[PDB]
């Protein structure tokens, strides 16, 4: 069997854990959202190939520069998330996360995930950013950051609606195999 390892990195509170939770369960937590996702192996098929994808959350490790990298060795694909309702989280991609990930993960493919897309169109969210002279990240900003950092692909999704989640891991697995 083909064992690959995924590590999902990004700013705190920009989706990371929520995203991993739906995917593995194929359903958005109804009654109660969990805080803790545990290291877990997911079965995924792609291009008629069966993969065992080790899923690694990095939640909680965002402030601890020398704990974080204990998570990076032997990694086949990195999901870098920002949140679309947070143009700050995005500028942290080129400035905090890629330089890091390229240092500890030479030549490991990166897929740029734009999370909380279900919010590019939310009047409350749009106001608050309009408060700091900001507005929800547009798709070409994502697409452009993706070609800027040398990502394998750019994918937007919504943990809420489940829209684009499945499509995100499939890409990541395609990436691992390459």
């Amino acid at each position: 069997a083909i064992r690959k390892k995924l590590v999902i990195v990004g700013d705190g509170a920009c989706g990371k854990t929520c995203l991993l939770i739906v995917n593995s369960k194929d359903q958005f937590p109804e009654v109660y959202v969990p805080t803790v996702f545990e290291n877990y192996v997911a079965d995924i098929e792609v291009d008629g190939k069966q993969v065992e994808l080790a899923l690694w959350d990095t939640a909680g490790q965002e402030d601890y520069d020398r704990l974080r990298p204990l998570s990076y060795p032997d990694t086949d694909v990195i999901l870098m998330c920002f949140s679309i309702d947070s143009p700050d989280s995005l500028e942290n991609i080129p400035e905090k996360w890629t330089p890091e990930v390229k240092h500890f993960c030479p030549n490991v493919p990166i897929i740029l995930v734009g999370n909380k897309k279900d919010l590019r169109n939310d009047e409350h969210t749009r106001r608050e950013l309009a408060k700091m002279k900001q507005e929800p990240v547009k798709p070409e900003e994502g697409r452009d950051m993706a070609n800027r950092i040398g990502a394998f692909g750019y994918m937007e999704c919504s943990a809420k609606t489940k829209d684009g989640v499945r499509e995100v891991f499939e890409m990541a697995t395609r990436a691992a195999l390459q």
Partner: peptide, 23 residues
């Protein structure tokens, strides 16, 4: 082992510690 390797399992102490302020 839930199909995980030694090197995966063993880092779970560090991981659990980091989940405590979130919890």
């Amino acid at each position: 082992c839930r199909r995980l390797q030694l090197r995966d399992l063993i880092i779970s102490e560090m991981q659990r510690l980091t989940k405590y302020p979130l919890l």
